[PDB]
Amino acid sequence: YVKTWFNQPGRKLRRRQARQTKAAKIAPRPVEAIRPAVKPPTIRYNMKVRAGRGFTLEELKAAGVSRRVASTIGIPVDHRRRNRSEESLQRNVERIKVYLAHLIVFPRKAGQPKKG
Amino acid sequence: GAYKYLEELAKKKQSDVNLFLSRVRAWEYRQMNVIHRASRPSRPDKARRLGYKAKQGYVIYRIRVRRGRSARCTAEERVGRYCSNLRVLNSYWVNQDATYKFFEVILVDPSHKAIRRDPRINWIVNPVHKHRESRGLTSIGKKSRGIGKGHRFWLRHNTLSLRRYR
Amino acid sequence: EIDAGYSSDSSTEDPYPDYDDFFTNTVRETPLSSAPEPKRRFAPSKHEQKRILQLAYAIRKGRILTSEQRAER
Amino acid sequence: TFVSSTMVRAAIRNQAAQRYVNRQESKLERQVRAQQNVIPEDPLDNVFA
Amino acid sequence: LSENIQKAIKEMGFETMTEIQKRSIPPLLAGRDVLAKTGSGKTLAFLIPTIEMLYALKFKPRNGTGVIIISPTRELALQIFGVAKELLKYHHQTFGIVIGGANRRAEADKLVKGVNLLVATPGRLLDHLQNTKGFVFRNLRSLVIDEADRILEIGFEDEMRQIMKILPSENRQTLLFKVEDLARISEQGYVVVDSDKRFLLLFSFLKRNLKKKVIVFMSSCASVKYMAELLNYIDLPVLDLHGKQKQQRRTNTFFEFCNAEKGILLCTNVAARGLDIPAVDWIVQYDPPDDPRDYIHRVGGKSLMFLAPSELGFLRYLKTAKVSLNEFEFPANKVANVQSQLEKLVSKNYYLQQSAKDGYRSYLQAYASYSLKSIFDINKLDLAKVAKSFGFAHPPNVNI
Amino acid sequence: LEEEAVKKAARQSNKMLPLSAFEHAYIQRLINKYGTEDFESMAKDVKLNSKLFNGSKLKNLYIRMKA
Amino acid sequence: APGLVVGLNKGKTLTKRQLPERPSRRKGHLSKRTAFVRSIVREVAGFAPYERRVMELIRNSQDKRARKLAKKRLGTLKRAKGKIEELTSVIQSSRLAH
RNA sequence: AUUGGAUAUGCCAUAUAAAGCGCUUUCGAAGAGUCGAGUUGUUUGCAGCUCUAAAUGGGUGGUCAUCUAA
RNA sequence: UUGACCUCAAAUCAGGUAGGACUACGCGCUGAACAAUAAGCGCAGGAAAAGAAAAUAACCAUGAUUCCCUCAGUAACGGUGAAGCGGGAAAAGCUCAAAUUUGAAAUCUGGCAACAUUUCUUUUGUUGUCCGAGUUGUAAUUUCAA
């Protein structure tokens, strides 16, 4: 049982081509969703900062975005992560606020029945 | 309302009510064929909570397997092979005695338009689910092959991945 | 202080009692539903009020024969 | 009589934890010297440029 | 005072400071530990500085709780909460109350999301300060204790020692209203009527004396709303001291009853606590008072007692009180049995039913919150009979 | 892209809804009987409040009937 | 400019927040209704044959063997302790009612 | 020619309706021959047999943390 | 009695569906040599399986699964031989059972009638009516993140 990496330049170009069709389908929105900033859970890397999965419910409510719409404007949700330190709430709320600063939202046509 | 009460009456399987029923039901089931249709589930609340809904296309078959591979996992392979067209949803214990285990197996008709048009049970019409009792993709199949999240739950070892630049 | 006394049953050396109603002997004086009563059980049904509206839909557009049309038909 | 065998298990963890921080510090300390230890401009090399 | 606070005080008509408030409110603005007579406008005395204090720090639901006010009983906690909601209607701070006998699963999630101003019973406060998670009570800026003598007489000895230890006393002023030890750490008429016929008898009594001035005292503000709604709904127009829980309406209704030579009014013990009793022909206490020694002092027309046949220990209490007494008999044949129509209307109607259960729940909680357990015991009283009085053939399922 | 977002929102500006005939006469029957301020009291009545609306939704109908 | 800046650190200043309650942690609370449902079914289904013999031992007052029998049948003391307390609750209730 | 997701615009809308956030003096159901134990095979789990449960419980980790199976 | 309801059957009763083939990849059962190994048997797809924690961890804590790189030939075992961590690819979340719609089974297959519709006279629907399914529970509702 042996594996060869001859398709390594083939697979990389397939991935790039897979990104370009995604960009074609969804033009204005970025090819990647926003991710939060979290700290690795170990004494070795705890002083580091990296990306998370999504923004917890305290990070959404504090920033001012409901949890239902957040999934629609590209902000992802992590029901499992929680905020134990306020610096973790702060680094990710401002991460949301800077995102909503640059976020153009296209209006959608809405059904308007004659009566009500 | 009722399936709360039926939940805790089925939790005591050696009490007099159940043991008196275990003898009465096992005697009459052995009188029947090995695999036979059942109109209403012998355990309505268990069939309910396992996915069964009282509507057309939902079927139930009762099977006895000799004691002495899993017994319940067997009941699913034998029922499905009997009803070749139905997709097996689930299975549950109904009764047992000294020489047999009686199992009920729920099946779905992939062709019935009450099922095919049901937004929630549509997933079973897809061919990838052909005979899930045969591949080990049911609940007991998932358990009997040790699939799950945990620390208590091959070729990645033997392989020799030689990268392009090595 | 156990005195190291050994039980006499150590491994190292009516079938039909009457129905005992110990729980239902006394009648409960309150219900179990602690939840407040909703509005549905006191307001006209919204199930038919929805069905009525789409019946008016079918009447207005001529989808279904009317009651007076049914009698003459 | 010493700690525990799994308490010496953490002895690597108090040995390995200060690896990543040491390595990151070595990266910036090397770069800081690089800014310091650079050759001056040689003002005679802009005659033609 | 702030602009927001000044405008709200006009809604209830609260403009002139009380005699106690004259030397308290001006001093309480400095935020110093300051340690009144019955019904003397105290409610605003320890509330005006607190709401101003919250606005000074610009409190938010994020900032936890800053002010905690402690009440001897449930009913008093209701009175302060009612005033707090009216004067904070023009502010962005959060007003809340946690009390004994309430939904502590709904008394907790409210605190988790952020509560700044809180009025609480010592029993429920101790539970939250020790067992509730997510409640941010490290940032207390004000602590208020009202009627310490009543608090100590209830049986809150170990509660004050435990609770006040938890409260961070640094950077905080304390308002106090054995007491020094706590500050060191800083004629009668009665009718023997059964519970089931209690409501029926009073309805007949109001029917007979419709052309006389009658006032009835009950143990719940929720009961006041229910009976007033019920009586006005059976073609018995009755004034009450609840309205829409508006203090201005209560003052207007009380004032209107004063000039009116005839009428029937409903209010609680704390509702009339401190108010001047006008010339009234008939005064009645429907439920047993929570302050028996204040009941004898308040009376000192003609007085009436509505007592159950199993709570006659209060009559013996009058012997120990050296107060003369007399009994009034009633033949049950002439008591109107409108009970057949009453419960039928309750089941038919929605809002009337909801008032009854809330009044019923408040009646049982207030009874369970009594002090004289050797006189009034919840276990001795039959719950089925009490539920019949409220208009329920069967008791509603209230958690204790 | 941003300019089109403003214009698309400009077209979709009329978010206020009118009233149909049923709720129209529904609100007049309540208004002319229980004034125009005690919305809680008018939600407490059941003889005219057939659907048993709450105070919050009655106020919404009152605002919507204006325009 | 929305941009993640990873590496080094972001901040050493710490402030713990008293975490709320998650409703999945609430599992295992005794619902008031279901206690009644479990009790009523316990009365109806009767008692297990081995569990019936435990009652007689308690009535005969050989509690030591009652623990031994339940422990043997169930598997651990805490499982046996709860059953014994469950059984003795039945016995006292039947004796006061009957 | 055959289709796909969008835009533009015409018509029809059964809306007396349906949602999100908010506040709660009212509530909050949670998967059994399963988990678990003894014991025997298979290769730690899985399987048979013997018994067989609980309701701040139950599993797992370090009096705590995390998780919420059938 | 009638006749309901339950079971029992039959019919060239209508509408269906299953089998065998392929097997590189894939999911199971099972298996000796020389090792979950060949084989044997069973079941599938354009991928299959897995999957939104009864998951780690002891941290400033992380956050469905899958694959890659490292962790590492390390721990552990006694040569066999990993997993968190970290870094990348990709990302998306959800539906039931347990609630009385109870002021109204609101749900659905099938026959028939017209209306349509098409990769299509070869497809797939709607409306109306009738009959069944269903109250031993089909819709809405709610899934712990609540």
Side-chain angles (χ1 to χ4, degrees), chain A, chain B, chain C, chain D, chain E residues 8 13 26-27 30-31 36 38-177 183 187-275 278-400, chain F, chain G:
Chain A
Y1 317 117
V2 69
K3 138 89 178 198
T4 54
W5 292 57
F6 302 135
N7 49 330
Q8 201 182 9
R11 164 203 317 287
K12 177 193 170 39
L13 162 77
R14 154 173 50 251
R15 296 183 161 156
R16 300 198 80 218
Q17 296 183 317
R19 271 185 276 274
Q20 285 244 15
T21 167
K22 186 201 197 184
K25 189 201 184 313
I26 52 180
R29 19 180 281 180
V31 305
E32 269 194 9
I34 183 158
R35 309 280 155 199
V38 312
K39 292 196 171 278
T42 280
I43 193 52
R44 179 160 167 191
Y45 308 93
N46 68 262
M47 92 306 313
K48 200 180 184 307
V49 154
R50 56 155 177 92
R53 191 184 159 79
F55 300 82
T56 192
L57 298 156
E58 310 139 349
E59 283 164 34
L60 304 148
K61 226 61 193 173
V65 180
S66 63
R67 66 157 320 185
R68 254 81 191 161
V69 317
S71 313
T72 87
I73 47 158
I75 299 168
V77 194
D78 187 356
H79 61 279
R80 285 164 283 234
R81 200 161 61 73
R82 50 200 67 78
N83 293 128
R84 297 184 201 80
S85 88
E86 146 74 5
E87 58 107 24
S88 34
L89 188 142
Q90 185 209 41
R91 73 165 41 116
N92 270 349
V93 156
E94 317 281 358
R95 171 97 166 133
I96 293 166
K97 264 165 172 146
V98 66
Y99 180 76
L100 274 173
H102 306 62
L103 202 62
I104 302 156
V105 281
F106 282 34
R108 167 192 52 146
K109 60 216 80 48
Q112 204 95 76
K114 315 303 175 300
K115 310 282 108 173
Chain B
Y3 321 102
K4 198 69 172 67
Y5 291 77
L6 292 186
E7 154 193 333
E8 315 106 355
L9 181 163
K11 278 158 137 181
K12 336 262 176 64
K13 299 176 196 55
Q14 312 287 47
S15 44
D16 46 49
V17 168
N18 286 100
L19 208 45
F20 165 88
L21 257 288
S22 274
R23 295 288 330 251
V24 171
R25 279 213 257 271
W27 163 241
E28 66 160 50
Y29 291 160
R30 255 187 52 202
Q31 280 193 332
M32 289 163 189
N33 203 350
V34 157
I35 302 182
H36 42 286
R37 178 88 187 272
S39 49
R40 294 152 219 72
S42 42
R43 309 177 62 194
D45 70 301
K46 185 81 181 162
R48 179 152 186 76
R49 92 159 52 84
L50 289 210
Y52 168 81
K53 319 273 291 196
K55 60 145 69 185
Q56 290 153 292
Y58 278 88
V59 196
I60 278 179
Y61 272 65
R62 200 180 299 105
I63 170 169
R64 53 156 180 269
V65 279
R66 321 205 82 262
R67 323 161 78 96
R69 193 190 169 67
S70 168
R72 184 186 152 201
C73 204
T74 294
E76 292 177 336
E77 290 232 46
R78 286 190 196 174
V79 168
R81 193 132 275 158
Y82 194 71
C83 318
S84 48
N85 50 318
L86 305 187
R87 310 296 176 70
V88 47
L89 180 70
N90 232 1
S91 168
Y92 55 96
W93 186 89
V94 307
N95 191 4
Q96 84 179 359
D97 69 345
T99 72
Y100 276 102
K101 275 176 162 342
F102 300 84
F103 284 109
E104 256 180 348
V105 178
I106 316 155
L107 304 100
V108 184
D109 204 351
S111 303
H112 205 267
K113 285 278 177 29
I115 289 294
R116 298 180 80 90
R117 291 180 189 141
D118 205 354
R120 303 156 138 124
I121 200 76
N122 269 136
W123 57 271
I124 211 162
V125 201
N126 296 333
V128 65
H129 294 121
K130 270 173 210 160
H131 272 248
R132 326 181 321 149
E133 95 277 332
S134 182
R135 269 172 281 147
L137 316 166
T138 57
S139 184
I140 183 53
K142 285 164 111 159
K143 199 259 279 180
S144 297
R145 62 188 211 182
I147 281 288
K149 306 200 171 161
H151 73 274
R152 296 314 250 179
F153 284 85
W154 159 83
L155 191 44
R156 198 226 191 271
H157 148 281
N158 286 300
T159 179
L160 196 93
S161 164
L162 296 182
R163 320 201 272 207
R164 216 156 44 110
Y165 300 78
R166 46 157 208 273
Chain C
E1 291 86 3
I2 66 167
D3 307 325
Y6 301 4
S7 283
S8 63
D9 73 325
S10 187
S11 183
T12 36
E13 268 313 305
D14 49 347
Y16 313 124
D18 253 28
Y19 170 79
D20 298 333
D21 44 310
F22 54 86
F23 190 41
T24 82
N25 59 347
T26 183
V27 51
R28 196 191 149 98
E29 90 266 9
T30 70
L32 291 203
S33 66
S34 48
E37 294 259 319
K39 268 301 196 39
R40 317 177 275 243
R41 304 172 195 155
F42 307 87
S45 54
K46 304 191 68 177
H47 296 320
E48 319 146 351
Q49 192 40 248
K50 146 190 159 170
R51 258 272 279 282
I52 278 165
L53 265 192
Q54 70 210 21
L55 277 192
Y57 172 8
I59 287 289
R60 287 187 264 160
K61 322 300 148 72
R63 263 164 159 225
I64 167 179
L65 84 177
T66 80
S67 180
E68 61 206 40
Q69 187 183 141
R70 185 191 294 270
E72 63 169 318
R73 190 256 320 149
Chain D
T1 43
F2 75 90
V3 282
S4 317
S5 53
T6 172
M7 270 316 78
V8 189
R9 170 255 177 226
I12 314 110
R13 284 276 195 169
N14 63 59
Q15 182 101 61
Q18 53 204 330
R19 175 156 293 113
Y20 167 81
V21 299
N22 275 320
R23 185 146 216 182
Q24 288 287 106
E25 198 211 352
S26 170
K27 274 159 46 189
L28 58 95
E29 204 68 26
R30 196 211 297 135
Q31 285 196 357
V32 155
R33 300 165 205 161
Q35 279 224 54
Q36 275 303 112
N37 303 330
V38 85
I39 318 165
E41 91 266 21
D42 192 0
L44 266 73
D45 288 3
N46 222 32
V47 279
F48 304 117
Chain E
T38 199
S40 61
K42 24 176 73 148
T43 307
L44 254 59
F46 44 100
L47 193 151
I48 279 300
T50 53
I51 177 178
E52 203 78 21
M53 166 33 39
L54 285 187
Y55 164 90
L57 322 176
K58 302 289 280 184
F59 251 69
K60 307 166 176 292
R62 181 178 200 275
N63 307 121
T65 179
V67 181
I68 278 180
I69 310 172
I70 319 186
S71 155
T73 45
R74 262 195 62 255
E75 193 96 352
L76 272 310
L78 200 166
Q79 195 172 20
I80 320 298
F81 179 56
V83 173
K85 72 173 103 164
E86 265 269 42
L87 318 191
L88 270 151
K89 79 186 290 182
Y90 286 118
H91 254 106
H92 300 344
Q93 272 99 40
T94 50
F95 47 93
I97 172 168
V98 303
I99 42 176
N103 208 306
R104 65 185 306 268
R105 218 175 158 166
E107 275 182 336
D109 224 23
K110 153 192 45 60
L111 292 164
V112 162
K113 311 318 205 300
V115 168
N116 312 134
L117 202 144
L118 191 47
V119 192
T121 304
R124 198 34 62 86
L125 206 54
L126 184 52
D127 178 32
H128 290 342
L129 293 205
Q130 286 200 306
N131 325 309
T132 295
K133 295 184 194 197
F135 179 41
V136 190
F137 62 94
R138 75 191 130 80
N139 305 322
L140 272 304
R141 195 68 104 178
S142 196
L143 151 64
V144 194
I145 293 177
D146 305 329
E147 314 216 12
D149 43 356
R150 283 216 93 176
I151 291 187
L152 263 304
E153 277 193 5
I154 281 289
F156 278 136
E157 168 72 30
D158 54 73
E159 287 92 324
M160 300 324 88
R161 255 209 302 270
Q162 190 41 252
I163 278 174
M164 172 145 168
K165 190 266 298 176
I166 310 152
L167 289 138
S169 180
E170 83 278 14
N171 302 327
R172 177 208 86 206
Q173 73 284 60
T174 306
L175 305 310
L176 179 55
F177 276 67
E187 50 269 12
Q188 190 41 75
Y190 74 104
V191 169
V192 185
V193 54
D194 200 5
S195 305
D196 58 350
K197 295 292 299 183
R198 206 165 53 114
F199 181 89
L200 279 288
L201 165 158
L202 81 91
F203 168 69
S204 51
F205 193 76
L206 296 200
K207 273 209 302 178
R208 295 294 304 159
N209 291 269
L210 261 176
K211 50 207 56 181
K212 291 190 186 304
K213 196 151 184 174
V214 192
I215 172 68
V216 190
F217 289 170
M218 71 225 77
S219 281
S220 165
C221 179
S223 297
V224 152
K225 162 190 179 175
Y226 175 42
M227 311 265 288
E229 167 147 33
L230 189 47
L231 290 178
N232 300 342
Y233 205 84
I234 57 173
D235 203 339
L236 263 299
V238 180
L239 320 177
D240 66 89
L241 218 62
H242 185 90
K244 305 192 299 183
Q245 268 306 112
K246 289 165 66 176
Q247 285 45 58
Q248 196 268 332
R249 292 303 301 272
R250 298 158 99 144
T251 52
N252 169 266
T253 320
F254 171 73
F255 174 66
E256 280 301 317
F257 191 51
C258 287
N259 49 283
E261 83 292 336
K262 73 187 306 307
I264 167 61
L265 183 73
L266 306 176
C267 95
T268 76
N269 271 95
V270 301
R273 187 243 184 187
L275 278 190
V280 153
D281 158 55
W282 264 137
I283 66 167
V284 188
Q285 190 78 34
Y286 178 38
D287 323 318
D290 46 351
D291 39 3
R293 60 316 176 282
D294 186 76
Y295 178 35
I296 56 172
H297 188 273
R298 202 269 323 155
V299 50
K302 290 287 287 186
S303 65
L304 201 36
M305 186 25 41
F306 280 13
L307 193 64
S310 61
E311 301 158 345
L312 271 307
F314 191 59
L315 264 299
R316 183 227 39 79
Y317 191 81
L318 263 74
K319 296 286 113 176
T320 53
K322 337 332 170 194
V323 169
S324 64
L325 68 76
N326 44 3
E327 198 271 344
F328 297 85
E329 57 91 21
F330 70 101
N333 66 320
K334 70 175 179 68
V335 185
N337 48 357
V338 78
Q339 147 82 14
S340 306
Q341 201 269 352
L342 174 60
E343 95 293 24
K344 170 59 193 68
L345 173 73
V346 159
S347 291
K348 196 177 228 172
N349 192 1
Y350 169 83
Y351 287 104
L352 185 72
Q353 166 152 3
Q354 207 152 25
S355 287
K357 186 163 185 163
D358 302 347
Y360 178 73
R361 161 163 49 247
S362 180
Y363 183 69
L364 283 196
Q365 281 150 343
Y367 203 92
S369 80
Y370 280 174
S371 67
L372 289 197
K373 295 291 108 189
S374 66
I375 292 91
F376 308 124
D377 193 5
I378 168 175
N379 303 133
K380 194 60 59 65
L381 187 52
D382 198 356
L383 256 50
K385 305 283 107 175
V386 170
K388 196 138 49 192
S389 81
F390 262 97
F392 285 120
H394 302 86
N397 196 38
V398 181
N399 186 7
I400 311 301
Chain F
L1 300 171
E2 181 73 325
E3 182 295 335
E4 288 179 350
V6 193
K7 180 53 178 65
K8 267 152 76 76
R11 154 72 226 169
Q12 313 174 190
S13 46
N14 184 17
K15 290 306 186 178
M16 271 318 267
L17 305 97
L19 296 202
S20 192
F22 163 80
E23 69 263 27
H24 203 317
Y26 200 110
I27 220 64
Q28 323 294 150
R29 194 165 57 259
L30 261 292
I31 271 168
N32 56 10
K33 191 65 182 295
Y34 299 58
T36 193
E37 299 302 323
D38 37 353
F39 280 92
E40 180 73 35
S41 81
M42 83 187 339
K44 184 157 296 298
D45 162 60
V46 317
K47 298 74 185 161
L48 330 171
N49 225 351
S50 325
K51 269 293 178 77
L52 269 177
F53 285 108
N54 53 340
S56 62
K57 206 168 170 187
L58 284 183
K59 267 184 67 176
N60 174 34
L61 293 178
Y62 180 64
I63 308 284
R64 284 176 48 193
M65 77 92 76
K66 224 147 269 178
Chain G
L4 193 56
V5 170
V6 304
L8 260 197
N9 67 338
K10 200 172 290 296
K12 278 272 280 182
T13 299
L14 261 206
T15 316
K16 303 293 187 163
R17 336 167 68 246
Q18 188 43 267
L19 280 183
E21 279 277 280
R22 277 154 73 90
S24 98
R25 285 234 170 100
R26 187 91 202 187
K27 198 158 179 186
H29 179 272
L30 180 60
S31 176
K32 280 106 65 166
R33 166 173 165 253
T34 190
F36 160 85
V37 189
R38 271 164 204 171
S39 176
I40 214 170
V41 156
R42 150 94 303 175
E43 182 295 335
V44 154
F47 302 88
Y50 94 98
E51 161 185 70
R52 281 271 188 195
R53 154 151 31 81
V54 166
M55 327 196 318
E56 192 203 78
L57 254 56
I58 290 295
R59 278 186 178 94
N60 154 285
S61 291
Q62 282 304 326
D63 56 352
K64 195 88 163 297
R65 284 94 182 97
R67 246 168 304 289
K68 287 199 191 298
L69 169 62
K71 184 261 151 190
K72 174 246 192 171
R73 227 65 160 154
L74 299 185
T76 199
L77 269 283
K78 57 170 304 312
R79 286 178 170 213
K81 294 161 58 198
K83 187 78 70 143
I84 280 189
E85 296 304 320
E86 201 134 12
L87 261 303
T88 193
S89 51
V90 152
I91 300 315
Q92 61 189 131
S93 290
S94 291
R95 279 300 98 201
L96 60 92
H98 309 79

